[PDB]
Design a protein around this ligand. Structure first.
Ligand SMILES: O=c1ccn([C@@H]2O[C@H](COP(=O)(O)OP(=O)(O)O)[C@@H](O)[C@H]2O)c(=O)[nH]1
Ligand SMILES: O=c1ccn([C@@H]2O[C@H](COP(=O)(O)OP(=O)(O)O)[C@@H](O)[C@H]2O)c(=O)[nH]1
Ligand SMILES: CC(=O)N[C@@H]1[C@@H](O)[C@H](O)[C@@H](CO)O[C@H]1O
Ligand SMILES: [Li+]
Ligand SMILES: [Li+]
Lengths: 359, 366
């Protein structure tokens, strides 16, 4: 029996890790541990650790860490509280593997804690490029302190190998979140229509825009005749906009508070195009044959493919892309969890492999 | 007037950083800040902050962090205490740059603290390899979180560039500590003997052994037994660092001291002037410290390097690599018996003439 602990610090990355957790839990020779922390214990986002429990999981260790503040000083303090809790949490859990996804500072924290305490780290989504204040640097630091690496694409695996990781320790397995696409039983147009009191049978745009003046977006959709607009929630700067557009056209736009992964993929499935700058637009929309118009550069650095139509944040260049989207796989198909588990079962990665020099 | 804050966690790195610190203090266009922490405030490692102050430097911010419990979980907790202190220290200092040397866990802590608080990091001694310690992965993580890089050799600079750092931010300026060869006057055998009440005129090994932190079950008896098998030489020890697993080494050192009181000198921490004075006259530098492969060859003193803590570093012909094995150590010892300094100024003018306020993009190799 191998103890596989999954680290989770936000609702979104828990969503991405969901099916790997389900598979470990189901697998009889693998014991699932869960270390939940950071924004799962934030009242701003409704204590999303409860969602983990409601989905059938047992939170093995929980570590409140986030300070109620907006300063970066308080982010450093939050990271310190995190390290203090992670020491005792890893001490009690004694995982054989710690699964860490992404590049948030609490994942950096737990990764270095694991390194010091000799818990092997399996890192997901290393080798990626997504410019920010410093999210990139942190991602690569996590890569350097991890023992095995599950990249989502070949460019990413190659960049991980350039970072000095042994090729036998890097695996292109696809994007784990896309397992949802492969395992969801989608709601029909009738079911979605009855559930949200809205006729999804008249085609629509699904639009998730996240805050990076968003005017040349909401002036860019008023022009598009004869389409309904289903929004998810991204904030008052854009929420106020979305609401203004609602009141102007009270019927042919629907704003939904929280879709949920199943309903969300069902509405995204039956859409002409995913509009906006969310990450859904650069992985889930391609896997669901629905074109994407990505706005601005919040998703700058992610790999592209046929379906992606990137346009700057101005009115005209958007209004063109919408119609062009009314005029019609590197991250994989969605069996990533099983590939990850097969590699974990068949590979020794207890120790950090020797640094890999190119040549 | 640019604010250059120098981070210092241990004696070792402080001595390495000395001439850079003194040159910034002396340079009237740069304001020296110092963030001292970790082993500088532990009585078990000498309270070496006193050395910093006595050298004429002002400790702008101090952060005690080291937990006394000798476990890996206590090391993690020490790093967390570090972060909680560095938050306020860096908040007040508002440095224009933070200078971080090396690969220890407190340096990882302060580097991520500075990154999160948008304080550019100048990292010294990146691109090297020390496979036997978790300092290895720490070092590459610190490289990825640093803005400008000062390496000690072209091989190391090249490894920094492979790590995805922009070429114009990686500089080969040499090892800063070796500036002590030209600018620091060495003590003589008589002054060392009066200063430590121990005769340095008799042949002696200088021994420094730290926990090899990737080794699962470190048992250091083969070294000390090996030392006991030698005749007519003295054993002068510095203390192991604060990594988990050091109290075992301290225990073995105290056992050896009680066994051979007239032949053993245990010093928690020398001044680096004193330390280089002792190393220069030793029969050999025994142990697994980084001085065995930079300072010790530079002073023409043979090195007996034990284990894998220094595995991967550049070698030369006076480096004797052995396993943690009684016979290999005894024989390397029997052999040992029987038988350019402008780095600081280069770093300073690079920091003066370069803009590294923002992390440069990831450098993909062709
Ligand atoms: O009402 C909603 C809106 C979004 N999502 C999910 O939230 C995830 C993250 O969305 P987004 O791309 O906006 O995150 P970001 O890219 O901004 O980090 C996606 O996988 C969606 O499936 C959801 O479950 N319900
Ligand atoms: O008692 C000592 C021992 C070390 N040093 C300095 O620290 C460096 C490295 O020694 P140490 O074992 O403490 O560090 P590490 O092996 O971890 O690099 C040497 O080159 C010396 O310049 C010192 O000043 N006093
Ligand atoms: C700082 C110090 O005292 N010792 C060494 C230093 O010589 C070396 O270059 C560095 C590698 O990053 O690792 C430190 O442990
Ligand atoms: Li299971
Ligand atoms: Li000065």
């Amino acid at each position: 029996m191998k103890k596989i602990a999954v680290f989770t610090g936000t609702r979104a990355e828990y969503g991405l890790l969901y099916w790997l957790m389900r598979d470990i839990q189901q697998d009889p020779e693998l014991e699932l541990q869960i270390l939940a922390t950071a924004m799962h214990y934030s009242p701003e986002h409704g204590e999303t650790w409860k969602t983990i429990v409601k989905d059938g999981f047992e939170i093995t260790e929980s570590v409140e860490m986030l300070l109620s503040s907006d300063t970066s000083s308080a982010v450093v303090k939050s990271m310190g509280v995190g390290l203090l809790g992670f020491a005792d949490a890893l001490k009690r859990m004694q995982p054989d593997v710690l699964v860490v996804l992404g590049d948030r500072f609490e994942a950096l924290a737990v990764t270095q804690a694991a390194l010091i305490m000799h818990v092997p780290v399996a890192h997901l989504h290393g080798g990626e490029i997504t410019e920010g204040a410093y999210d990139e640097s942190i991602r690569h630091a996590i890569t350097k302190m991890s023992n095995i690496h599950f990249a989502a694409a070949e460019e990413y695996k190659k960049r991980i190998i350039q970072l000095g990781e042994q090729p036998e320790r890097v695996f292109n397995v696809g994007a784990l979140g896309l397992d949802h696409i492969q395992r969801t039983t989608f709601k029909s147009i009738s079911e979605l229509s009855e559930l949200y009191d809205f006729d999804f049978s008249k085609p629509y745009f699904l639009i998730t825009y996240h805050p990076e003046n968003v005017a040349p977006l909401f002036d860019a959709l008023k022009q598009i005749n004869d389409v309904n607009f289903i929004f998810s929630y991204p904030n008052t700067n854009i929420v106020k906009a979305m609401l203004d557009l609602k009141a102007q056209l009270p019927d042919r736009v629907l704003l939904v508070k929280s879709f949920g992964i199943q309903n969300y993929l069902s509405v995204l499935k039956n859409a002409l195009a995913m509009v906006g700058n969310s990450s859904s637009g650069l992985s889930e929309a391609p896997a669901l044959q629905v074109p994407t118009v990505n706005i601005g550069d919040r998703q700058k650095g992610r790999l592209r493919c046929e379906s992606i139509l990137d346009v700057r944040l101005d009115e005209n260049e958007i209004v063109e892309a919408l119609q062009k989207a009314i005029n019609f796989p590197p991250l994989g198909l969605g069996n990533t969890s099983q590939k990850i588990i097969e590699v974990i079962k068949t590979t020794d990665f207890k120790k950090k492999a020797p640094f890999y020099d190119l040549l």
